[PDB]
Amino acid sequence: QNVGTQAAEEPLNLPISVCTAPGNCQTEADAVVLDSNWRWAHTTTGYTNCYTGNLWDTTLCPTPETCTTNCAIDGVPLADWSGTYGGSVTGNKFNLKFVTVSTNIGARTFLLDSTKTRYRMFQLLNREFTYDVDVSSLDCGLNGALYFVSMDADGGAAKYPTNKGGAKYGTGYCDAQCPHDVKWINGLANSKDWTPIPGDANSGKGYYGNCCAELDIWEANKQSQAFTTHPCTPNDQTRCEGVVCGDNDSGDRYNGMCDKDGCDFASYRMNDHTFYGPGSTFKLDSTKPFTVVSQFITTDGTDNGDFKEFRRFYVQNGVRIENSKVNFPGITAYDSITDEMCAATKGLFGDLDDHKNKGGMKQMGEAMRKGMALVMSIWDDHDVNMLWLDSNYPPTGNPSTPGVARGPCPTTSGVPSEVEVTQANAVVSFGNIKFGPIGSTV
């Protein structure tokens, strides 16, 4: 995309901590940038929309190349962050409102480095990543997500010279779902064969998808939470078409370059329904804030080893809370993501181990070694109504069959039109982000 001249781009300042030992950290003066999908797209030498509602203008965008020549994405000024997009920062806390009323629904954002010209790339192997979260106002159907993806640090600017904005304009998004709803891919409008998504007034799908590796630290609302590894072959940003995208709609979910299911550790799905929930007698009380700690263990305990284990623990009101465990007869009580856990649990659930097909923890680790961009988002789910996270999936499945039940939400929950009314004022908060060696962040 070209860059427009109507509004300066002003990312929100967000300090994080880089740590060397427990309680010995230094501030890193980073910032938050809005994903290019949420930006106004208009004519390069005017005010005329190139995209309105869920459609590209066919006169301006008869082809992707012409669209890209004629159109530009514009900046987010400071005033518009809260007023238009529902984003705000107080000290080291970042807040994202779900619906902001001209009416904005959801948000996806990235962490910029201290220069505000590149994404802050995190080399996560043999490191610990930690943050405080509040998901108390997110119920069934919503997801306040924090995760990493194998985006380029410059959003693709060096690879795709028609991308003028780079990381500064939140470009280059890709993930392990190979999404077609990304409006700008490889420096070009994804306007070919663009199709609105029914019941989604703001979104559509273009000819291409954009694939890359994804490490989900946090997919969650107050009812259920998960962390998940998604390797791809290769891991780096890859525009896809046809079978390579692994499109759900053509029966290709397991035929593409990315592991779409991922290998998940989701406490409720692993059959501990009392670990996490909205109340003081759950082990971890989702009505109150808490700290989420993630440790990425290698084979030799060094930065050069292969990724072998994703460990997790929590801190809430000064109380250390170890992760829940897998709880099925004849299955080891795993409390972390490893290749063995993935094989054993997917075996039990009858899920295809595409994680293993894509190179497993080792391949996931190669993405983490090269460095990944931090994503913070809030969203509802127009495909599957978040049932995969917090309900029975498939909805018609027996909840006593291992793998089906992922949370207590009813199978009628999560319809975007309903959650966008009922949960309009939901806000996820991510704060006090800390990064360092294992054992350094609490």
Automatic annotation (TrEMBL):
It is an enzyme of class 3 (hydrolase). This is cellulose 1,4-beta-cellobiosidase (non-reducing end). One of its GO terms (molecular function) is cellulose 1,4-beta-cellobiosidase activity. SUPFAM superfamilies: Concanavalin A-like lectins/glucanases (SSF49899). The keyword Hydrolase applies. Gene3D superfamilies: Glycoside hydrolase, family 7, domain. InterPro entries: ConA-like_dom_sf, Glyco_hydro_7, Glyco_hydro_7_sf. Belongs to the glycosyl hydrolase 7 (cellulase C) family. Its EC number is 3.2.1.91. It catalyses: Hydrolysis of (1->4)-beta-D-glucosidic linkages in cellulose and cellotetraose, releasing cellobiose from the non-reducing ends of the chains. The lineage of its organism: Eukaryota, Metazoa, Ecdysozoa, Arthropoda, Crustacea. Disulfide bonds join 19-25, 50-71, 61-67, 140-409, 174-212, 178-211, 232-258, 240-245, 263-342. Keywords: Carbohydrate metabolism, Cellulose degradation, Glycosidase, Hydrolase, Polysaccharide degradation, Pyrrolidone carboxylic acid, Signal. The modification Pyrrolidone carboxylic acid is found at residue 1. One of its GO terms (biological process) is glucan catabolic process.
